[PDB]
């Protein structure tokens, strides 16, 4: 040890009607994501895919927690059970159940997202922040 047990390397929004790839490289500087955004068409169904390595010892109780913030005054949190993953060379990919982008004129515009990849022991495997913008059209 010192070497980290879990290395989170990517986030991908999985949506077949998105015209281009929607991906964050989580291995580098994380600050630049704060002023970027992914556009999603209102009401579209998508999933979030987290890519990650496990290095040393099995990790069980893994969990993906996402807080969604809207205009600094409204918050919604979802916590997803990820599973138990043995150490191994090859990357893993977790995908959430299907979610639906916010729908309605009043639901358009910007949302901030606080993502945390953690476990039963509250290890901060990676925390990060990114943004969605909900639009009428792609
Ligand atoms: Li938090």
Swiss-Prot record:
<comment type="subunit">
    <text>Monomer. Interacts with FER. Interacts with PLXNB3. Forms a heterodimer with RAC1. Interacts with RHOA, the affinity is increased by three orders of magnitude when RHOA is prenylated. Interacts with PSMD10; the interaction increases ARHGDIA association with RHOA, leading to ARHGDIA-mediated inactivation of RHOA and ROCK and prolonged AKT activation. Interacts with KANK2; the interaction is direct and may regulate the interaction of ARHGDIA with RHOA, RAC1 and CDC42. Interacts with RHOC. Interacts with CDC42. Interacts with NGFR (via death domain); NGFR binding decreases the affinity for RHOA.</text>
</comment>
<keyword id="KW-0007">Acetylation</keyword>
<feature type="cross-link" description="Glycyl lysine isopeptide (Lys-Gly) (interchain with G-Cter in SUMO1); alternate">
    <location>
        <position position="74"/>
    </location>
</feature>
<dbReference type="GO" id="GO:0005829">
    <property type="term" value="C:cytosol"/>
</dbReference>
<dbReference type="GO" id="GO:0005096">
    <property type="term" value="F:GTPase activator activity"/>
</dbReference>
<protein>
    <recommendedName>
        <fullName>Rho GDP-dissociation inhibitor 1</fullName>
    </recommendedName>
</protein>
<keyword id="KW-0963">Cytoplasm</keyword>
<feature type="cross-link" description="Glycyl lysine isopeptide (Lys-Gly) (interchain with G-Cter in SUMO2); alternate">
    <location>
        <position position="74"/>
    </location>
</feature>
<feature type="modified residue" description="N6-acetyllysine">
    <location>
        <position position="41"/>
    </location>
</feature>
<dbReference type="GO" id="GO:0005856">
    <property type="term" value="C:cytoskeleton"/>
</dbReference>
<dbReference type="GO" id="GO:0070062">
    <property type="term" value="C:extracellular exosome"/>
</dbReference>
<comment type="similarity">
    <text>Belongs to the Rho GDI family.</text>
</comment>
<keyword id="KW-0343">GTPase activation</keyword>
<dbReference type="GO" id="GO:0043066">
    <property type="term" value="P:negative regulation of apoptotic process"/>
</dbReference>
<feature type="cross-link" description="Glycyl lysine isopeptide (Lys-Gly) (interchain with G-Cter in SUMO1); alternate">
    <location>
        <position position="77"/>
    </location>
</feature>
<dbReference type="GO" id="GO:0005634">
    <property type="term" value="C:nucleus"/>
</dbReference>
<keyword id="KW-0225">Disease variant</keyword>
<dbReference type="GO" id="GO:0035023">
    <property type="term" value="P:regulation of Rho protein signal transduction"/>
</dbReference>
<dbReference type="GO" id="GO:0005094">
    <property type="term" value="F:Rho GDP-dissociation inhibitor activity"/>
</dbReference>
<dbReference type="GO" id="GO:0032880">
    <property type="term" value="P:regulation of protein localization"/>
</dbReference>
<feature type="cross-link" description="Glycyl lysine isopeptide (Lys-Gly) (interchain with G-Cter in SUMO2); alternate">
    <location>
        <position position="77"/>
    </location>
</feature>
<dbReference type="GO" id="GO:0071526">
    <property type="term" value="P:semaphorin-plexin signaling pathway"/>
</dbReference>
<dbReference type="GO" id="GO:0016020">
    <property type="term" value="C:membrane"/>
</dbReference>
<feature type="modified residue" description="N6-succinyllysine; alternate">
    <location>
        <position position="77"/>
    </location>
</feature>
<feature type="modified residue" description="N6-acetyllysine">
    <location>
        <position position="114"/>
    </location>
</feature>
<keyword id="KW-1017">Isopeptide bond</keyword>
<dbReference type="GO" id="GO:0098693">
    <property type="term" value="P:regulation of synaptic vesicle cycle"/>
</dbReference>
<dbReference type="GO" id="GO:0007266">
    <property type="term" value="P:Rho protein signal transduction"/>
</dbReference>
<keyword id="KW-0597">Phosphoprotein</keyword>
<dbReference type="GO" id="GO:0098685">
    <property type="term" value="C:Schaffer collateral - CA1 synapse"/>
</dbReference>
<dbReference type="GO" id="GO:0001772">
    <property type="term" value="C:immunological synapse"/>
</dbReference>
<comment type="function">
    <text>Controls Rho proteins homeostasis. Regulates the GDP/GTP exchange reaction of the Rho proteins by inhibiting the dissociation of GDP from them, and the subsequent binding of GTP to them. Retains Rho proteins such as CDC42, RAC1 and RHOA in an inactive cytosolic pool, regulating their stability and protecting them from degradation. Actively involved in the recycling and distribution of activated Rho GTPases in the cell, mediates extraction from membranes of both inactive and activated molecules due its exceptionally high affinity for prenylated forms.</text>
</comment>
<keyword id="KW-0832">Ubl conjugation</keyword>
<feature type="modified residue" description="N6-acetyllysine">
    <location>
        <position position="63"/>
    </location>
</feature>
<feature type="modified residue" description="N6-acetyllysine; alternate">
    <location>
        <position position="77"/>
    </location>
</feature>
């Amino acid at each position: 040890a010192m070497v980290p047990n879990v290395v989170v390397t990517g986030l991908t929004l999985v949506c077949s009607s998105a015209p281009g790839p929607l991906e964050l490289d989580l291995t580098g500087d994380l600050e630049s994501f704060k002023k970027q955004s992914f556009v999603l068409k209102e009401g579209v169904e998508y999933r979030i895919k987290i890519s990650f390595r496990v290095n040393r010892e099995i990790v069980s109780g893994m969990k993906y927690i996402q807080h969604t913030y809207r205009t600094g005054v409204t918050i919604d949190t979802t916590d997803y059970m990820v599973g138990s993953y043995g150490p191994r060379a090859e990357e893993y990919e977790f995908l959430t159940p299907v979610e639906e982008a916010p729908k309605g004129m009043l639901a358009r515009g910007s949302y901030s997202i606080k993502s945390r990849f953690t476990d039963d022991d509250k290890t901060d495997h990676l925390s990060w922040e990114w943004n969605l913008t909900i639009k009428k059209d792609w």
